[PDB]
């Protein structure tokens, strides 16, 4: 059945190449070669995590027959109130070394070994502000002792935490900031969603002034909202049988937000 | 009954000539002529005991006229909390000699005498971490006194045991890692399992995108799960009079895990 394939596709996810993703990758590649620690900051729907995943999937783990994998880029995400033993546990599991019982100094010495053995060049830490304040001692340690570009990723909250400690703020001063879409850039991106992601069989002409008064007001320029609003309006339109979105149905979806 | 023949076949075991198995045997052959002790590490479902057993089935015992049997590779698995006596008892029994009522320092001398007499070149100790910490002095004594390559085989815990003692870490510093399946290697292996192991009269063609999604989720790259799952699907399917494994019966199996 035609409809149910589109409804499955629309509920799925994809990475669209956009300027903000391209701009991050060309900055992270510079920090990887120069071995400089830095931070990516921005608001909570700008798509930082998809940009960092898109980067992890560029540099894939290279393999040699009998050796640990060569892993240029590591990406981890801590749990809330992450302690030193929880951070080390995750870096070790990511490199596919099983983690045995031990004390914090065992976990430290093992994490430092596997980061050298796998040839890591960059360590991307998402939601960095879940780290307990003391763990930053171990993050600065990794970054000064090993040739690793630590990237901290997070919202404005992160800097409020970081400014509480000079020792950290100064390792992590260099920053790239993610912003919101506007003007021609919002208008152009809506057309990329229409053609590349929604793939509706009648064009919805979403770049028209009457559609863009809806989308600009409702999405406020966030790529997270734009993907959510348009997939919902496409699911709702196709399940009602229309071959494209229309002014009243997009109004019905936008009224909830 | 033709059907009763097939279920007796699928219930059993067989060895598939995977690249990872070929990679181990080529590495251990360098170590056997060089006479260098080493260790093999990796996760518990990656193929390690089977890859070591296949190397023991190569290099089976010689028997020239008027000599003892020459036995180039010895392979053993200790029992849990294996003591200094029990290790010597296993090495002696693998070499077909009977052993009679010794004190441990008799078992030691009789082991050294048969290890010399049988011309042993290599000793593969599977689940090496079942060894009690004090037995490693007897393993180092075998490795230093005789011209023997000892291969310790085990999981990431083995490393945790070895790192507790400098004396051992240094004799056994070199190592190879067994790892999980991925990407085109997982797909090629599933195709090989279908034609090599399952042999149903009609093709199931499991390399099809829709079916590899079920298997990748169900197996997470372990060669262990892949085999169990494909066997259980052939057994169940055959008991119900089907000519193939299909989409629905394969999901019925994988849900149990």
């Amino acid at each position: 059945e035609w409809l149910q394939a589109e409804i499955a596709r629309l509920k799925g996810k994809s990475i669209v190449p956009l300027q903000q993703v391209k701009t991050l990758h060309d900055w992270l590649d510079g920090k990887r070669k120069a071995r400089k620690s830095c931070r990516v900051v921005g608001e909570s729907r700008t798509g930082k995590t998809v940009a960092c995943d898109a980067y992890r999937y560029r540099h894939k783990p290279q393999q040699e027959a009998g050796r640990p994998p060569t892993v240029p880029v590591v990406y981890i995400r801590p749990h809330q109130k992450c302690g030193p033993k929880d951070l080390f546990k995750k870096i070790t599991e990511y490199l596919k070394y099983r983690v045995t019982k031990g004390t914090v100094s065992d976990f430290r010495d093992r994490t430092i070994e596997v980061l050298k053995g796998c040839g890591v060049e960059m360590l991307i830490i998402d939601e960095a502000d879940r780290l307990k304040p003391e763990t930053f001692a171990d993050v600065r340690d990794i970054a000064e002792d090993l040739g690793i570009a630590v990237v901290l990723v997070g919202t404005d909250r992160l800097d409020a935490v970081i400014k509480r400690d000079e020792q950290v703020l100064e390792r992590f001063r260099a920053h790239l900031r993610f912003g919101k879409l506007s003007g021609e850039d919002f208008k152009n991106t809506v057309e990329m969603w229409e053609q590349m992601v929604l793939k509706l069989p009648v064009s919805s002409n979403l770049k028209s002034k009457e559609m863009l008064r809806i989308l600009t007001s409702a999405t406020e320029g966030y790529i997270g909202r734009l993907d959510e609003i348009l997939r919902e309006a496409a699911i709702r339109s196709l399940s009602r049988g229309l071959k494209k979105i229309d002014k009243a149905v997009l109004q019905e979806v936008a009224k909830e937000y | 009954e033709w059907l009763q023949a097939e279920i007796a076949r699928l219930k059993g075991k067989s060895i598939v000539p995977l690249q990872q198995v070929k990679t181990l045997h080529d590495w251990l052959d360098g170590k056997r002529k060089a006479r260098k002790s080493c260790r093999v590490v990796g996760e518990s479902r990656t193929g390690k005991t089977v890859a070591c057993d296949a190397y023991r089935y190569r290099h089976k015992p010689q028997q020239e006229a008027g000599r003892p049997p020459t036995v180039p590779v010895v392979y053993i698995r200790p029992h849990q909390k294996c003591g200094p006596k029990d290790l010597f008892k296993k090495i002696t029994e693998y070499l077909k000699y009977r052993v009679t009522k010794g004190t441990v320092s008799d078992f030691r001398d009789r082991t050294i005498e048969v290890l010399k007499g049988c011309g042993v070149e290599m000793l593969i100790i599977d689940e090496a971490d079942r060894l009690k910490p004090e037995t490693f002095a007897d393993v180092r004594d075998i490795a230093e006194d005789l011209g023997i390559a000892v291969v310790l085989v085990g999981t990431d815990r083995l490393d945790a045991v070895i790192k507790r003692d400098e004396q051992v870490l240094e004799r056994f510093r070199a190592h190879l890692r067994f790892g999980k399946l991925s990407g085109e290697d997982f797909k090629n292996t599933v195709e090989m399992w279908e034609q090599m192991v399952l042999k149903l009269p009609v093709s199931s063609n499991l390399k099809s995108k829709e079916m590899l999604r079920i298997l990748t989720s169900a197996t997470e790259g372990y060669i262990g799960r892949l085999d169990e799952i494909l066997r259980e699907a052939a057994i169940r399917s055959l008991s119900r009079g089907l000519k193939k494994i299909d989409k629905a019966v394969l999901q019925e199996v994988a849900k149990e895990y």
Binding site: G12, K13, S14, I15, V16, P17, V50, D53, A54, R56, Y57, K60, P61, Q62, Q63, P69, V71, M192, M196, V197 | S182, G183, T216
Partner: peptide, 14 residues
């Protein structure tokens, strides 16, 4: 331009 299914990059990564 190409646009990547996020689960396809997840499948193709090591």
């Amino acid at each position: 331009i190409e646009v990547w299914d996020y689960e396809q990059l997840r499948e193709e990564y090591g």
